[PDB]
Write a protein that binds this ligand. Sequence first.
Ligand SMILES: OC[C@H]1O[C@@H](O[C@H]2[C@H](O)[C@@H](O)[C@H](O[C@H]3[C@H](O)[C@@H](O)[C@H](O[C@H]4[C@H](O)[C@@H](O)[C@H](O)O[C@@H]4CO)O[C@@H]3CO)O[C@@H]2CO)[C@H](O)[C@@H](O)[C@@H]1O
Ligand SMILES: *[C@@H]1O[C@H](CO)[C@@H](O)[C@H](O)[C@H]1NC(C)=O
Ligand SMILES: [Cl-]
Ligand SMILES: [Cu+2]
Length: 235
Amino acid sequence: HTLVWGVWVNGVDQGDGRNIYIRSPPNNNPVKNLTSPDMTCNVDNRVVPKSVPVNAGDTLTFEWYHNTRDDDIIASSHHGPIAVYIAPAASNGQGNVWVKLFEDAYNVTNSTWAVDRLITAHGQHSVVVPHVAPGDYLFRAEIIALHEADSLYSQNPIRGAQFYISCAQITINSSDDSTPLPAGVPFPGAYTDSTPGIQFNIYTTPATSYVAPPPSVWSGALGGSIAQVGDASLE
Ligand SMILES: OC[C@H]1O[C@@H](O[C@H]2[C@H](O)[C@@H](O)[C@H](O[C@H]3[C@H](O)[C@@H](O)[C@H](O[C@H]4[C@H](O)[C@@H](O)[C@H](O)O[C@@H]4CO)O[C@@H]3CO)O[C@@H]2CO)[C@H](O)[C@@H](O)[C@@H]1O
Ligand SMILES: *[C@@H]1O[C@H](CO)[C@@H](O)[C@H](O)[C@H]1NC(C)=O
Ligand SMILES: [Cl-]
Ligand SMILES: [Cu+2]
């Protein structure tokens, strides 16, 4: 159970974004129905008033929280991968428009899942803004908690993969547009019961054998990281 408070740009807090530049749900309940419109931008997808100004090469840091800002972020039980997708605001999330900018499942070195490191990072994880057409975008951050993904939601609606999904409104001003955004996958649509990473037993199987749901990270992605980039407590 977790939500996005707002974003930092190049280590500068853009202030509370909830229902402002983040299309926030009314609460931190998970999305589990793979075929639902709710897979797009969660249970309350609608144009909100603001869109954060950024440029290609900026570091965009999403900040997640549980109850209060900078609390315990998400429950330690919610082991799983983190992904960021991008779509043109044009789409409003509809059609084959989502391009993956980032994927992080399990780090063998430190033996931590993306979610484990997100708790350590005070809920902060980042992507580098890619060289797409200047304009308005949604950045869709997705946490998959697998603490019950041993079942499918479609077969047992009290278990299944949990999706914590948050769309930020981002305006990309300066960009040479060296990497025009390709067509992407739909949500709902790209994740089905057979798709790998959706059904997995983290209790019986080792985390090194885990394989995140596709699609693959676009070649035009300039990567990203899970790490604190600023102190929320100094505000
Ligand atoms: O731990 C392995 C075990 O996990 C079982 O699943 C547990 C989760 O581990 C546990 O973390 C989860 O806790 C939920 C709780 O069910 C929610 O009701 C609660 O929701 C709160 C919310 O946290 C508040 O932020 C908000 O203000 O109010 C709501 C209202 O209820 O949130 C917590 C997580 O923070 O409970 C699960 C029980 O299913 C698996 O079933 C089992 O297979 C695993 O072995
Ligand atoms: C899942 O979502 C679809 C599409 O909105 C809906 O028709 C269906 O009732 C939901 N499935 C379950 C298991 O509730
Ligand atoms: Cl839960
Ligand atoms: Cu939860």
